[PDB]
Amino acid sequence: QISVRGLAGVENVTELKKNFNRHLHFTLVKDRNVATPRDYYFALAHTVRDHLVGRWIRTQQHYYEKDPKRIYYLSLEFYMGRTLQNTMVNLALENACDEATYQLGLDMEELEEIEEDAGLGNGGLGRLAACFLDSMATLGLAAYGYGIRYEFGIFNQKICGGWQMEEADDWLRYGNPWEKARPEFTLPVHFYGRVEHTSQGAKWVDTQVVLAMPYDTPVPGYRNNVVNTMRLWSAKAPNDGYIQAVLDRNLAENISRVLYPNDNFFEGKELRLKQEYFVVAATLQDIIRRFKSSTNFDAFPDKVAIQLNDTHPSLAIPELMRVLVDLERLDWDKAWEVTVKTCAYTNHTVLPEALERWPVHLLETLLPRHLQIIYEINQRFLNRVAAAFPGDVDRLRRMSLVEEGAVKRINMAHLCIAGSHAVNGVARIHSEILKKTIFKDFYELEPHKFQNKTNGITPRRWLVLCNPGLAEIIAERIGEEYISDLDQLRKLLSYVDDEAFIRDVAKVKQENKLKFAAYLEREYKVHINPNSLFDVQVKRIHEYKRQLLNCLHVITLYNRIKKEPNKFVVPRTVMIGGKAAPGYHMAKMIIKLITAIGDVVNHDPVVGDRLRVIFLENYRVSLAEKVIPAADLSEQISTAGTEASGTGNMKFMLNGALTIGTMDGANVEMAEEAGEENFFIFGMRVEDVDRLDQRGYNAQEYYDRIPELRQIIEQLSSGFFSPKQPDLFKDIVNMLMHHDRFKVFADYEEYVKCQERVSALYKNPREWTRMVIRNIATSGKFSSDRTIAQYAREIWGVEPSRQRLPA
Amino acid sequence: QISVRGLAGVENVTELKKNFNRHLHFTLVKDRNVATPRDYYFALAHTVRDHLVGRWIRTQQHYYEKDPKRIYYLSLEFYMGRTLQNTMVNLALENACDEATYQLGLDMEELEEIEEDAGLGNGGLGRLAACFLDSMATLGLAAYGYGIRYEFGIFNQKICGGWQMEEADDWLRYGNPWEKARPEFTLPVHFYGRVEHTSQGAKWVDTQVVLAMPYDTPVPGYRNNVVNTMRLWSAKAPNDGYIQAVLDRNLAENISRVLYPNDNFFEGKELRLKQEYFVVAATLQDIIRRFKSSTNFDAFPDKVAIQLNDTHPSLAIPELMRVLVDLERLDWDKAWEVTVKTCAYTNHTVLPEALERWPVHLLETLLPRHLQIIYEINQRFLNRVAAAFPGDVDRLRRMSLVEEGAVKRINMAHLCIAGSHAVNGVARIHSEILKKTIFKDFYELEPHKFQNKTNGITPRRWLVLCNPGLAEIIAERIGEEYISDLDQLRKLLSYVDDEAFIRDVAKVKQENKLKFAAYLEREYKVHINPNSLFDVQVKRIHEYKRQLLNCLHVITLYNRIKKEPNKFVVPRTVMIGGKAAPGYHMAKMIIKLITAIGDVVNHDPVVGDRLRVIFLENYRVSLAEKVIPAADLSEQISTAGTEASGTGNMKFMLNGALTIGTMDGANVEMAEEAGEENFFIFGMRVEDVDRLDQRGYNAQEYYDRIPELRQIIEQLSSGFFSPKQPDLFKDIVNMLMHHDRFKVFADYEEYVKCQERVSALYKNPREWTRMVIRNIATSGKFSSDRTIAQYAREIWGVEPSRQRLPA
Ligand SMILES: O=C(/N=C1/NC(=O)[C@]2(O[C@H](CO)[C@@H](O)[C@H](O)[C@H]2O)S1)c1ccc2ccccc2c1
Ligand SMILES: O=C(/N=C1/NC(=O)[C@]2(O[C@H](CO)[C@@H](O)[C@H](O)[C@H]2O)S1)c1ccc2ccccc2c1
Ligand SMILES: *Cc1c(COP(=O)(O)O)cnc(C)c1O
Ligand SMILES: *Cc1c(COP(=O)(O)O)cnc(C)c1O
């Protein structure tokens, strides 16, 4: 049907059709009279998968022959989403498969909907890893994603009586066609034991062994025939009364059982520490094995880069030391040199509660040798600080890897900085925050180490895949090359006064909104006005992301309508979605508040279809692909200084929504690229937040001086939104009035006024759309291809390449 | 190379070769430069598997169209062994695959050795089910094997310092290519809860749900294009703080985790009871579903037979009642009629310690509704007994399903007899023992119910597959038809005086012995004389099987040699193998004794290579396939009355070993078929055992009157076979002298004398071989095709058929 989806060549359609029937028969062991849509999905998946195989084997043997520097991206999270469409798009097979399936009497879109999200991540951090893998393959880098194959990913969210319920995400139920088990490359990982000092050196003995079994998933580049590998480790018990011994194997296998859902919040659980060491230990053995298969580790950093994502794989540093010193018998200083030059650290958040500080007594029991190594690292590091800042004893305690207190802890961030040749934040303002406040001491010691790498999103998944209509009308004007060179979208500025283009942009959006409005009615039995402004806030539920500020605005619009029912207001559908961590009580109350507001607003006859409030259940990657293309307004309203980057923001910008946001994270750079005129900026800057903290934040002051705000609080306290439970939202009110770390009231007035300017512009369709065009056209910077090219050149020391391998 | 292995057609060899390379590339994702033998095994397995698919789908749709009566064989054990060679043999693909693999530079025998045994059984009971499935497919019956897919089968046995060590049998480690997961046919199974009585009737509520997920394995008939199904259930947790809830899913999934290894010994564990109900509940739903997909259950017994193997699936009876009464709303009497006519019960052992007697308090908690139903069954059954034997109150308590005592128990055997239209034993003498002693009361009440079905073995696995040399020389004389009509082997009697045949028989044996002697040196680093008589006892280690009696003989030969070193004796290699249940201390001591005897005998310079004692480690189906064809003497020496049938006995007879045995189980019928002249029979008959029990067995009497026996006991007690631990075998000596339930001493003299007659005949090769020919030639009765044809006609009410389906 459309250009970007590739060719539907007769011979290719014929081959696809026959391989589809082959898989249905020989792989699924079904006939067409008993097959269900799920069987058809799997037959298609196997048919598409076959096309990866040759390229995957060729790519990997190519890396063996040429022996480039290898990039190892270590993360506890990879939020991959669905793989089928992505693979089709990247192999140029989408229209052919569409045609082939159509000719067999099947709707391919329907089969695509059967695939489960691979939800091996919480949100932005996990999704960044997924976008990054796509970009690394597209840029021809010899890159491996390494993580854990969780049996259960991020929980499925059900809303019951307005409350979040968590259900196990049993994503492997029907099998995963995209993974290849590699039980032959299983490696041992050690835990517990104790350290023995011999004449030869230290020795870690009496350990409990857990096996790490790899599963490889292919990562196809965009139309370059490169297929890289994501290797995820699964925990297996070694083979060495009777019945119970067999059942106790589960204890070891529990390591890879479930993803911790407590995003941006450190809890210090032992099982999580085991997960972290598990991924690190197996990965480094694999890395070393691959390096040796080409005594001398001098060239190790020329052939290996290890990128640490947050502190979660920070044990890579002492593990690499352990292997080099205890097993390879390198001297400490040489080992350290190799380690530092091999490792680099990316910080993704400065929220204090997210910082990993592991109790020493835990490390002592679980990883006794690693604690010894960390102590040694600390002593040599502080000697360097002492020599550079003589007499500065408070600096010494501030920079130490060891924190003193009732319980001694190890600060994993400090460890990462010490053992890495580069440290980066993920947006300019965040990286500056690192140098100025959080890691100031370290920046003063080693300024050369600190960098910025502003985040990005992949334009394959986040434009071509999820918004084919938009990708097509753009390709009509400027061709297809932008898909792997997103800066080319700048060429769209010369169409900002083009009447046909303005019409096309607005048509694509309207179609996306109709499609999404239909999804709502069909799959969730709820009606919305598709001519309303689609006001969307989708992200994890957290106080810092200030879903509550959005709630206050919604209640304000509602009270205004009730006060003057017969005045015109721009109709809105306000959509809020996202998951709360299971033990985050305040986040769960916020969800309940949103649904409660919806209960009142959506059933008030006076309001009509002028204001609707929907909580989008089970927000996840597959749902983001549907809602983001349908959005008019993107809510990016975190308190300045708290969102390190954000990436949802970028997705919305690329897909034709306008942004209302604070000058936080990557929003700053988005406003800078599009022009501040083309961005709905409001609220405190970081500097204002600091000024207010020095003075003391008093919420009461705002309650006293803003009647509209006062009314909302009184409605909350009195039970207006909770008739049968008048005091249900007391915790929320109390938090807002007395212990709001994120200053919701401080931005309320400017937010509401800024929202009025949004409504004003939406009344002028032509000027709305022209501003949209200016956003889309300047979104090029926020491609993960740009981000990864920067990592490659400035951190890993490798050159990206768009040259294709032979098919 | 050889006839029986089928055609190596050029076009077939070409197709096999290309599908092999296709699977290596697309399925295994390897190239020939990195592939290992294991990869080659899997490529071959996938290539062969492809040939089953069309036949499997065709067979099952054929059963749908014609709608024959369906046979459901319920067992907790299926000891399948390896599947690759069996599938090749049954599809006539063996030489083609041999040729195809040879042409790719691969040895097929080497790849066959890589396949793991499916060890989902303990021994003879599990193996009988496997043989039976093969025969049912070969006889064109619409038959399903139903059981549990254990994650861990029978443990791997390692011998350490002469002691058995158990290792988890992680048989699914590398995947199982022969199973197809069918997660779409997953069914709920209920546990716990309580019973609620309404106006409508009884209702079982507040249950915990476990999901039963089927895995289907194909069961190919012999060259008839029939492929039946073995469906094995796996336990899954349903999808409905947080971390721990996810980890606790393991509790539900533990149901299908491990096979209970306590063969012929009831322990009364709850997890085992859960396994039994799990298989029964899922299976019956599946059965009913299939029946409805063709209100009126009158025709249920015309379309369904359920064969219960031992009492392990005895809950099928009250479960079927529960479904018919509580869910389908049939009246009790009609439900009962349907149940009785649907179910049949096979008893496989009369050892008292093997009898399942479940504590009422267990059933009460776990399966409250089933206990109510069992009580009702009991009351109506005893009313029938009372009316037939008025006044006979002791009969009432003897026949009751409920046993009184400190703990009340349910006798599952009594339940089975009551709820089945047929009850059979597994060899003539055993079935007579059922009528005369164990189930006498029930036989008097319902004599028509009691039958015999003498066991059999499949001649495919147990001749063609494991002994191709023998199958070939037989086929040269009488053609190939005997392979599915084993009675034809009678034709070999007319070759008993044929000199070429005698030479061929003895040549095949000698080659088998050389091959097995090589296996010993290669895979276990031990040397044996291949010209010695191969004296073999392989079966589970149990007191009733009297491995100890064999040990006494071995020690007797040793002492005789030491007493007269320079006299000639027929050289022997004495081989004993088998697993002991982990908690069966006496069985573990017996293993240790065997290895200890080996330590003394095998290193005594005076003995030379005239006597060797080897314990065969990890006896299992794949090892039986190697050792049985190499055996000269088959030890079947259980105390008369204890081995219900035996099946190893039959395997040996078919493969050219002579039998030394008691008149126990199927040995009686084997001697009857071959002629007692052609069988080394010795020892007490059942009648003699009974006479001795009435009088009181006094072992001391034998110790007093047999000096050779006295010497052996004194050697045992004094520490001759345990120098560093003089008292190591005190328990054995004490048991033999004071509490030997199996009368080892009572058969010692006759056993030793009978063993001298064996040696005498072995000195005359020509007459040995002629006696062998008379055994092989009369082994036809012991085909499982005969057994299954008898079940079909006399129990299930269906006609077997050798007619082929279209390929
Ligand atoms: O940092 C974490 N989560 C993040 N999620 C994000 O979305 C963050 O990374 C993105 C990618 O750089 C940024 O765009 C977001 O602003 C930032 O919040 S950081 C985090 C921290 C501690 C955790 C502990 C247990 C489990 C998950 C955790 C995740
Ligand atoms: O009966 C059992 N085992 C048998 N094993 C056999 O080999 C038996 O069946 C064969 C097939 O009919 C007969 O040939 C054997 O003589 C008989 O011992 S019966 C048995 C009994 C209780 C069990 C409890 C837990 C686990 C396994 C069990 C097996
Ligand atoms: C992009 C994305 C995120 C991150 O969104 P932010 O608004 O930057 O927090 C979270 N979840 C999913 C499913 C995503 O696709
Ligand atoms: C046939 C067989 C058995 C049963 O042997 P008996 O001598 O009848 O106890 C046990 N185990 C295996 C592996 C078998 O093949």
Side-chain angles (χ1 to χ4, degrees), chain A residues 584-610:
Chain A
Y584 191 175
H585 175 261
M586 188 58 66
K588 286 194 163 190
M589 289 308 297
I590 292 165
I591 288 176
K592 174 57 175 171
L593 174 67
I594 293 158
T595 63
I597 290 164
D599 284 347
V600 172
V601 170
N602 298 346
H603 300 99
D604 188 323
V606 174
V607 174
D609 67 356
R610 289 184 290 171

mmCIF file of all heavy atoms in Angstrom, chain A residues 584-610:
data_model
loop_
_atom_site.group_PDB
_atom_site.id
_atom_site.type_symbol
_atom_site.label_atom_id
_atom_site.label_comp_id
_atom_site.label_asym_id
_atom_site.label_seq_id
_atom_site.Cartn_x
_atom_site.Cartn_y
_atom_site.Cartn_z
ATOM 1 N N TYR A 584 4.668 1.516 46.636
ATOM 2 C CA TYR A 584 4.692 2.975 46.631
ATOM 3 C C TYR A 584 3.252 3.465 46.857
ATOM 4 O O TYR A 584 2.483 3.710 45.911
ATOM 5 C CB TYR A 584 5.263 3.469 45.298
ATOM 6 C CG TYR A 584 5.610 4.946 45.181
ATOM 7 C CD1 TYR A 584 6.221 5.423 44.024
ATOM 8 C CD2 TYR A 584 5.320 5.864 46.188
ATOM 9 C CE1 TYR A 584 6.541 6.762 43.872
ATOM 10 C CE2 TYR A 584 5.638 7.210 46.048
ATOM 11 C CZ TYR A 584 6.251 7.655 44.885
ATOM 12 O OH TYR A 584 6.574 8.986 44.717
ATOM 13 N N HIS A 585 2.896 3.593 48.129
ATOM 14 C CA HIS A 585 1.532 3.896 48.534
ATOM 15 C C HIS A 585 1.001 5.198 47.940
ATOM 16 O O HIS A 585 -0.120 5.242 47.455
ATOM 17 C CB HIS A 585 1.452 3.959 50.058
ATOM 18 C CG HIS A 585 0.115 4.384 50.570
ATOM 19 N ND1 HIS A 585 -0.153 5.677 50.965
ATOM 20 C CD2 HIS A 585 -1.034 3.692 50.741
ATOM 21 C CE1 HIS A 585 -1.408 5.761 51.365
ATOM 22 N NE2 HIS A 585 -1.965 4.570 51.238
ATOM 23 N N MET A 586 1.797 6.258 47.996
ATOM 24 C CA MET A 586 1.387 7.545 47.449
ATOM 25 C C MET A 586 1.102 7.458 45.939
ATOM 26 O O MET A 586 0.174 8.089 45.453
ATOM 27 C CB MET A 586 2.450 8.617 47.728
ATOM 28 C CG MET A 586 2.033 10.035 47.369
ATOM 29 S SD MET A 586 0.544 10.597 48.231
ATOM 30 C CE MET A 586 1.137 10.640 49.922
ATOM 31 N N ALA A 587 1.894 6.678 45.212
ATOM 32 C CA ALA A 587 1.684 6.511 43.781
ATOM 33 C C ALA A 587 0.373 5.792 43.520
ATOM 34 O O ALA A 587 -0.327 6.112 42.567
ATOM 35 C CB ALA A 587 2.833 5.748 43.144
ATOM 36 N N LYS A 588 0.041 4.828 44.371
ATOM 37 C CA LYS A 588 -1.217 4.114 44.248
ATOM 38 C C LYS A 588 -2.425 5.001 44.561
ATOM 39 O O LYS A 588 -3.469 4.864 43.925
ATOM 40 C CB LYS A 588 -1.207 2.856 45.111
ATOM 41 C CG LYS A 588 -0.345 1.756 44.517
ATOM 42 C CD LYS A 588 -0.610 0.422 45.192
ATOM 43 C CE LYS A 588 -0.084 -0.711 44.334
ATOM 44 N NZ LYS A 588 -0.524 -2.043 44.824
ATOM 45 N N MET A 589 -2.273 5.921 45.514
ATOM 46 C CA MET A 589 -3.321 6.896 45.835
ATOM 47 C C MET A 589 -3.565 7.870 44.685
ATOM 48 O O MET A 589 -4.692 8.293 44.461
ATOM 49 C CB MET A 589 -2.952 7.706 47.087
ATOM 50 C CG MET A 589 -3.015 6.933 48.400
ATOM 51 S SD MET A 589 -4.585 6.082 48.649
ATOM 52 C CE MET A 589 -5.730 7.457 48.716
ATOM 53 N N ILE A 590 -2.496 8.243 43.987
ATOM 54 C CA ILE A 590 -2.588 9.137 42.838
ATOM 55 C C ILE A 590 -3.415 8.496 41.714
ATOM 56 O O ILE A 590 -4.258 9.154 41.124
ATOM 57 C CB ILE A 590 -1.190 9.560 42.346
ATOM 58 C CG1 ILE A 590 -0.527 10.455 43.403
ATOM 59 C CG2 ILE A 590 -1.270 10.323 41.027
ATOM 60 C CD1 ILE A 590 0.956 10.643 43.208
ATOM 61 N N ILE A 591 -3.174 7.218 41.436
ATOM 62 C CA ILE A 591 -3.969 6.484 40.462
ATOM 63 C C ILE A 591 -5.443 6.509 40.875
ATOM 64 O O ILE A 591 -6.326 6.791 40.059
ATOM 65 C CB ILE A 591 -3.490 5.024 40.331
ATOM 66 C CG1 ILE A 591 -2.138 4.985 39.608
ATOM 67 C CG2 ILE A 591 -4.520 4.185 39.584
ATOM 68 C CD1 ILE A 591 -1.517 3.609 39.508
ATOM 69 N N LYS A 592 -5.695 6.221 42.147
ATOM 70 C CA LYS A 592 -7.059 6.174 42.655
ATOM 71 C C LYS A 592 -7.713 7.548 42.541
ATOM 72 O O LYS A 592 -8.883 7.643 42.190
ATOM 73 C CB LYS A 592 -7.074 5.664 44.100
ATOM 74 C CG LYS A 592 -8.425 5.706 44.793
ATOM 75 C CD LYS A 592 -9.486 4.926 44.036
ATOM 76 C CE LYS A 592 -10.793 4.891 44.818
ATOM 77 N NZ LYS A 592 -11.889 4.315 43.996
ATOM 78 N N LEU A 593 -6.953 8.604 42.803
ATOM 79 C CA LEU A 593 -7.464 9.962 42.645
ATOM 80 C C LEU A 593 -7.863 10.254 41.197
ATOM 81 O O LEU A 593 -8.886 10.876 40.947
ATOM 82 C CB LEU A 593 -6.440 10.994 43.116
ATOM 83 C CG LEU A 593 -6.834 12.454 42.866
ATOM 84 C CD1 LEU A 593 -8.032 12.816 43.731
ATOM 85 C CD2 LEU A 593 -5.667 13.394 43.119
ATOM 86 N N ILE A 594 -7.045 9.812 40.247
ATOM 87 C CA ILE A 594 -7.321 10.059 38.836
ATOM 88 C C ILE A 594 -8.629 9.388 38.422
ATOM 89 O O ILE A 594 -9.457 10.004 37.770
ATOM 90 C CB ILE A 594 -6.186 9.549 37.937
ATOM 91 C CG1 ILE A 594 -4.920 10.379 38.169
ATOM 92 C CG2 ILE A 594 -6.603 9.590 36.470
ATOM 93 C CD1 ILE A 594 -3.656 9.670 37.761
ATOM 94 N N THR A 595 -8.800 8.131 38.809
ATOM 95 C CA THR A 595 -10.010 7.394 38.482
ATOM 96 C C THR A 595 -11.209 8.028 39.193
ATOM 97 O O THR A 595 -12.298 8.112 38.620
ATOM 98 C CB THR A 595 -9.900 5.896 38.837
ATOM 99 O OG1 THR A 595 -9.730 5.734 40.247
ATOM 100 C CG2 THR A 595 -8.720 5.259 38.117
ATOM 101 N N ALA A 596 -10.995 8.515 40.415
ATOM 102 C CA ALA A 596 -12.065 9.162 41.186
ATOM 103 C C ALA A 596 -12.525 10.468 40.529
ATOM 104 O O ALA A 596 -13.720 10.760 40.480
ATOM 105 C CB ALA A 596 -11.617 9.410 42.619
ATOM 106 N N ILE A 597 -11.572 11.246 40.022
ATOM 107 C CA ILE A 597 -11.889 12.464 39.286
ATOM 108 C C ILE A 597 -12.689 12.109 38.033
ATOM 109 O O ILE A 597 -13.695 12.754 37.727
ATOM 110 C CB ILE A 597 -10.623 13.250 38.902
ATOM 111 C CG1 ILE A 597 -9.986 13.860 40.155
ATOM 112 C CG2 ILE A 597 -10.957 14.355 37.911
ATOM 113 C CD1 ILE A 597 -8.556 14.316 39.959
ATOM 114 N N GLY A 598 -12.232 11.080 37.323
ATOM 115 C CA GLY A 598 -12.954 10.524 36.184
ATOM 116 C C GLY A 598 -14.380 10.118 36.512
ATOM 117 O O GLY A 598 -15.298 10.416 35.745
ATOM 118 N N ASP A 599 -14.581 9.456 37.651
ATOM 119 C CA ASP A 599 -15.938 9.081 38.078
ATOM 120 C C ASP A 599 -16.871 10.288 38.189
ATOM 121 O O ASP A 599 -18.039 10.201 37.816
ATOM 122 C CB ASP A 599 -15.928 8.326 39.414
ATOM 123 C CG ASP A 599 -15.463 6.881 39.278
ATOM 124 O OD1 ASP A 599 -15.376 6.360 38.142
ATOM 125 O OD2 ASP A 599 -15.187 6.258 40.327
ATOM 126 N N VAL A 600 -16.362 11.406 38.694
ATOM 127 C CA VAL A 600 -17.175 12.611 38.847
ATOM 128 C C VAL A 600 -17.347 13.344 37.524
ATOM 129 O O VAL A 600 -18.466 13.679 37.134
ATOM 130 C CB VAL A 600 -16.564 13.577 39.875
ATOM 131 C CG1 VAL A 600 -17.305 14.909 39.882
ATOM 132 C CG2 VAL A 600 -16.594 12.945 41.258
ATOM 133 N N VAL A 601 -16.236 13.589 36.839
ATOM 134 C CA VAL A 601 -16.239 14.412 35.633
ATOM 135 C C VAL A 601 -16.986 13.756 34.469
ATOM 136 O O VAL A 601 -17.785 14.408 33.801
ATOM 137 C CB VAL A 601 -14.807 14.756 35.192
ATOM 138 C CG1 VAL A 601 -14.794 15.410 33.814
ATOM 139 C CG2 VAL A 601 -14.150 15.661 36.222
ATOM 140 N N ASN A 602 -16.721 12.476 34.237
ATOM 141 C CA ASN A 602 -17.258 11.776 33.073
ATOM 142 C C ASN A 602 -18.757 11.499 33.151
ATOM 143 O O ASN A 602 -19.360 11.124 32.149
ATOM 144 C CB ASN A 602 -16.536 10.444 32.853
ATOM 145 C CG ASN A 602 -15.055 10.610 32.565
ATOM 146 O OD1 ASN A 602 -14.566 11.710 32.275
ATOM 147 N ND2 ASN A 602 -14.331 9.504 32.636
ATOM 148 N N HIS A 603 -19.354 11.670 34.327
ATOM 149 C CA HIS A 603 -20.782 11.403 34.509
ATOM 150 C C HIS A 603 -21.599 12.650 34.835
ATOM 151 O O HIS A 603 -22.800 12.545 35.054
ATOM 152 C CB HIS A 603 -20.983 10.349 35.598
ATOM 153 C CG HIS A 603 -20.334 9.039 35.281
ATOM 154 N ND1 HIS A 603 -19.107 8.673 35.793
ATOM 155 C CD2 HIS A 603 -20.729 8.020 34.484
ATOM 156 C CE1 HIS A 603 -18.780 7.480 35.334
ATOM 157 N NE2 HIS A 603 -19.747 7.060 34.539
ATOM 158 N N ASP A 604 -20.961 13.820 34.846
ATOM 159 C CA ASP A 604 -21.658 15.071 35.130
ATOM 160 C C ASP A 604 -22.330 15.557 33.837
ATOM 161 O O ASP A 604 -21.639 15.916 32.883
ATOM 162 C CB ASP A 604 -20.686 16.120 35.688
ATOM 163 C CG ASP A 604 -21.389 17.374 36.177
ATOM 164 O OD1 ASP A 604 -22.379 17.788 35.543
ATOM 165 O OD2 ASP A 604 -20.955 17.958 37.196
ATOM 166 N N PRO A 605 -23.680 15.562 33.801
ATOM 167 C CA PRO A 605 -24.407 15.930 32.574
ATOM 168 C C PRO A 605 -24.074 17.329 32.066
ATOM 169 O O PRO A 605 -24.053 17.558 30.864
ATOM 170 C CB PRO A 605 -25.884 15.863 32.993
ATOM 171 C CG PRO A 605 -25.910 15.044 34.234
ATOM 172 C CD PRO A 605 -24.607 15.314 34.924
ATOM 173 N N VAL A 606 -23.805 18.251 32.984
ATOM 174 C CA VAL A 606 -23.494 19.629 32.616
ATOM 175 C C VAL A 606 -22.181 19.720 31.825
ATOM 176 O O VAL A 606 -22.042 20.566 30.948
ATOM 177 C CB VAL A 606 -23.462 20.537 33.867
ATOM 178 C CG1 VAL A 606 -23.001 21.944 33.516
ATOM 179 C CG2 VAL A 606 -24.837 20.582 34.522
ATOM 180 N N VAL A 607 -21.234 18.832 32.120
ATOM 181 C CA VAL A 607 -19.928 18.849 31.462
ATOM 182 C C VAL A 607 -20.042 18.381 30.021
ATOM 183 O O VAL A 607 -19.401 18.935 29.142
ATOM 184 C CB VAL A 607 -18.897 17.969 32.208
ATOM 185 C CG1 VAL A 607 -17.592 17.881 31.429
ATOM 186 C CG2 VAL A 607 -18.640 18.521 33.602
ATOM 187 N N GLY A 608 -20.854 17.353 29.793
ATOM 188 C CA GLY A 608 -21.086 16.832 28.445
ATOM 189 C C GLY A 608 -19.880 16.067 27.948
ATOM 190 O O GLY A 608 -19.247 15.339 28.708
ATOM 191 N N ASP A 609 -19.557 16.231 26.671
ATOM 192 C CA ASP A 609 -18.320 15.685 26.120
ATOM 193 C C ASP A 609 -17.254 16.773 25.967
ATOM 194 O O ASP A 609 -16.380 16.674 25.110
ATOM 195 C CB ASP A 609 -18.590 14.965 24.787
ATOM 196 C CG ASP A 609 -19.025 15.908 23.673
ATOM 197 O OD1 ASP A 609 -19.202 17.122 23.927
ATOM 198 O OD2 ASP A 609 -19.188 15.426 22.531
ATOM 199 N N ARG A 610 -17.326 17.807 26.803
ATOM 200 C CA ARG A 610 -16.340 18.886 26.778
ATOM 201 C C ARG A 610 -15.081 18.570 27.592
ATOM 202 O O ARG A 610 -14.012 19.116 27.329
ATOM 203 C CB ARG A 610 -16.962 20.184 27.274
ATOM 204 C CG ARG A 610 -17.965 20.767 26.297
ATOM 205 C CD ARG A 610 -18.465 22.102 26.800
ATOM 206 N NE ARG A 610 -19.317 21.950 27.975
ATOM 207 C CZ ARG A 610 -19.753 22.962 28.715
ATOM 208 N NH1 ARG A 610 -19.410 24.210 28.413
ATOM 209 N NH2 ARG A 610 -20.533 22.729 29.762
#
